[PDB]
Design a protein around this ligand. Structure first.
Ligand SMILES: Nc1nc2c(ncn2[C@@H]2O[C@H](COP(=O)(O)OP(=O)(O)OP(=O)(O)O)[C@@H](O)[C@H]2O)c(=O)[nH]1
Ligand SMILES: [Mg+2]
Ligand code: NA
Ligand code: NA
Length: 377
């Protein structure tokens, strides 16, 4: 029973120290352990990121911890962070800083579902009034970006004094680990999410209509069930006459399976690149949306010059490129390579969409950036 988390926060606020403390304390108590030098030196579009593993008696955790702001932007945009919930590290010394807010903002924009707060460097704070002011400031900061500030768990502590061995502070690491179990709910498994099949290929087969092939991203497609072809044009409705995996005849199409879905009355020429197969009324097609994009730098194989309002690139949603016009934020004059901005995208063709969906920005078949669907319009 695996859950994905990460340490989010401002530079030097004690993110790496906390990650090491989490591994060591749960290792002394339940099982395992990693030290600062191991997590600070992060491996690996250059996203430097450490991937840590730790266990609770009830769950398994994959943890992400990055050296600087750049790697948090990159990981949240590119989806690679896979966070089911985040841990915001706030120092009681400094309090919410520029990157604290920017990490909460991006959290709202990339769809990080739950944020738990660890108030670090309490060993260095002697006034209680100071800690309550830093905690209120964080509660205020979370509720601004639609997070449940009043219902958010805020653990007071010292990642370093617990890392060193002081038993009083190891009790706060265990408190944190508890809220990672009680407060992050079990993520909904794909087989339970309504049916979604990105059309990867199409064929006109012998005496049995049209076959649509691809990988079932969510739920199940049962033979005889009504379906929808959402995307590039107006939504067409069909019926699943059959499900075929290679030469094996099936009646079910389960999530994570590469199948061939036989459709009724649908013709090879009515199927387009980028279209999907969905449970009726579970996914709608959109052209206009708010985005959170990261543009590749020269030393990342991206653009070597900036782009403006008149920029019109391709947006690789699931299976294909779709040209789109852009709307830059007020006061945003241009986008340099290596930049991170919000942008309103207007696609030529509608794509089946909901918030959280990722895309790649391209220019003549080469990736030049990456984005997230912040809000559909
Ligand atoms: N007093 C005290 N210092 C701490 C605590 N946690 C971290 N520090 C120190 O704060 C410094 C920076 O903390 P880091 O763990 O490196 O935090 P970071 O967010 O990963 O940032 P970088 O310094 O840029 O790598 C280090 O010298 C830590 O020893 C704490 O609980 N108490
Ligand atoms: Mg670090
Ligand atoms: Na049938
Ligand atoms: Na992509």
């Amino acid at each position: 029973p695996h859950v994905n988390v990460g340490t989010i926060g401002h530079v030097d606020h004690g993110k790496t120290t906390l990650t090491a403390a989490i591994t060591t304390v749960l290792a002394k108590t339940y099982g395992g352990a990693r030290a600062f030098d191991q997590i600070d030196n992060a491996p690996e579009i250059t996203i430097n990121t450490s991937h840590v593993e730790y266990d609770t008696p009830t769950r398994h955790y994959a943890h992400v911890d990055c050296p600087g702001h750049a790697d948090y932007v990159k990981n949240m945009i590119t989806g690679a962070a896979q966070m089911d919930g985040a841990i915001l590290v706030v120092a009681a010394t400094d309090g919410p800083m520029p990157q604290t807010r920017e990490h909460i903002l991006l959290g709202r924009q990339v769809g990080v579902p739950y944020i738990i707060v660890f108030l670090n460097k309490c060993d260095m704070v002697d006034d209680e009034e100071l800690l309550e002011l830093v905690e209120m400031e964080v509660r205020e900061l979370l509720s601004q970006y639609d997070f449940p500030g009043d219902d958010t768990p805020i653990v007071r502590g010292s990642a370093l004094k617990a890392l060193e061995g002081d038993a009083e502070w190891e009790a706060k690491i265990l408190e944190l680990a508890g809220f990672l179990d009680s407060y992050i709910p079990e993520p909904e498994r794909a087989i339970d999410k309504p049916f979604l099949l990105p059309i990867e290929d199409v064929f006109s087969i012998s005496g049995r209509g049209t076959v649509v092939t691809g990988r079932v991203e969510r739920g199940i497609i049962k033979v005889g069930e009504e379906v929808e072809i959402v995307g590039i044009k107006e939504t067409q409705k069909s019926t699943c006459t059959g499900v075929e995996m290679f030469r094996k005849l099936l009646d079910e199409g389960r999530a994570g399976e590469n199948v061939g879905v036989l459709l009724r009355g649908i013709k090879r020429e009515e199927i387009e690149r980028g279209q999907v197969l969905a449970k009726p009324g579970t996914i709608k097609p959109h052209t206009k949306f708010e985005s959170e994009v990261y543009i590749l730098s020269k030393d990342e194989g991206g653009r070597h010059t900036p782009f403006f309002k008149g920029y019109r690139p391709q947006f690789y949603f699931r299976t294909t490129d779709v040209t789109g016009t852009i709307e830059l934020p007020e006061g945003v004059e241009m986008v340099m390579p290596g930049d991170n901005i919000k942008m309103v995208v207007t696609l030529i063709h509608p794509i089946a969409m909901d918030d959280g969906l990722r895309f790649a920005i391209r220019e003549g078949g080469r990736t030049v950036g990456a984005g997230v669907v912040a809000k559909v319009l």
